[PDB]
Symmetry: C2
Subunit: 186 residues, 2 copies
């Protein structure tokens, strides 16, 4: 038969089937274009977005060490947080830097927006590069201080040899910033 | 300056369960005495695999429905590694189920975590070459349209929002780096 365009399935029903303090899982009844019915599960859709900041000062990246309960270990990577309602990406980035690393930035650049496993989650991550930093601290919600790690741009790619850093958002960010740095040749 | 001391886990408790999700509440005591109750997805040892097939200087991508964003993604074939399978074996089987091809040359490029703050799952990236026809039945509810994308313009994928997902992006850049190594550019 004739090749045809994509046709999204119709959502027959959506029901909350489990809720924790931070998670709300929904059961979604679907009917695909070919009439096949299936029940999928996903995290309740939200429009709350995240921001990840990549600070560069004196030819070094500023990374942080942060506990992750999912793996029960310390990850090495870029500062991340949520964009509060009403805030632009630049504003959330500046606020998160101040709260996590004690600096604000006069030069913030929005490089890319990414989704993460959209089959189950609808969250987006905005990658921002921060330069021309100045000291300024804000109170965050971290239970413990976030140790900072200065990493030379010239050896940026060595971060891929550290399993504590090898997380999809960190790796995507690393390569996107390097591409951007090439643009201006710095 | 003091060394890193992981918080101590005082208590773990299942607090919600769905068909595919089991959320745990974790009581923590950081080394500075601060106490917090974090929530996470029950830790698992099960791993995923993602395959990047290359044929005649082109990437083979697939379009697949994602209920979380209620849209069609454009990207690499992904699946779960079955217990007892190596990454190579899982990659070959998934290729077969999803694109109808097996591969004689499979290379394991990288292993990545995904939001370790709440999940503990790993994603293995495998490049597949020297393909041959061979189908296996998967459990997909509808066919997965295939899209051929030239290696010479692989970075243009970053201009398609249907493709811009952290795992696809990481794999794209890692495969490009690897291609450079064989002068495939
Ligand atoms: N959100 C979801 N919930 C349940 N199953 C899903 C979901 N997304 C994809 N799948 C199943 O796994 C994919 C493989 C598809 O074939 C489908 O059957």
């Amino acid at each position: 038969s004739l090749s045809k365009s994509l046709q999204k399935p119709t959502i027959l029903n959506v029901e909350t089937v489990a809720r924790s303090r931070l998670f709300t899982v929904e059961s979604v009844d679907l009917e695909f274009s070919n009439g096949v019915r299936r029940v999928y599960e996903r995290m309740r859709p939200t429009n709350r977005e995240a921001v990840m900041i990549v600070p560069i000062v004196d030819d070094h990246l500023i990374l942080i060490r942060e506990y992750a309960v999912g793996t029960e270990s310390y990850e090495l990577g870029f500062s991340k947080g949520l964009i509060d309602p009403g805030e632009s990406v630049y504003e959330a980035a500046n606020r998160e830097l101040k709260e996590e690393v004690g600096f604000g930035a006069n030069d913030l650049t929005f490089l890319k927006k990414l989704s993460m496993a959209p089959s189950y989650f609808s969250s987006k991550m905005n990658i921002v590069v921060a330069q021309d930093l100045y000291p300024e601290s804000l109170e965050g919600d971290e239970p413990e201080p976030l140790p900072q790690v200065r990493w030379p741009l010239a050896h940026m790619m060595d971060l891929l040899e550290d399993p504590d850093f090898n997380e999809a958002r960190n790796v995507s960010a690393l390569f996107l910033v390097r591409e951007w740095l090439k643009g201006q040749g710095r």
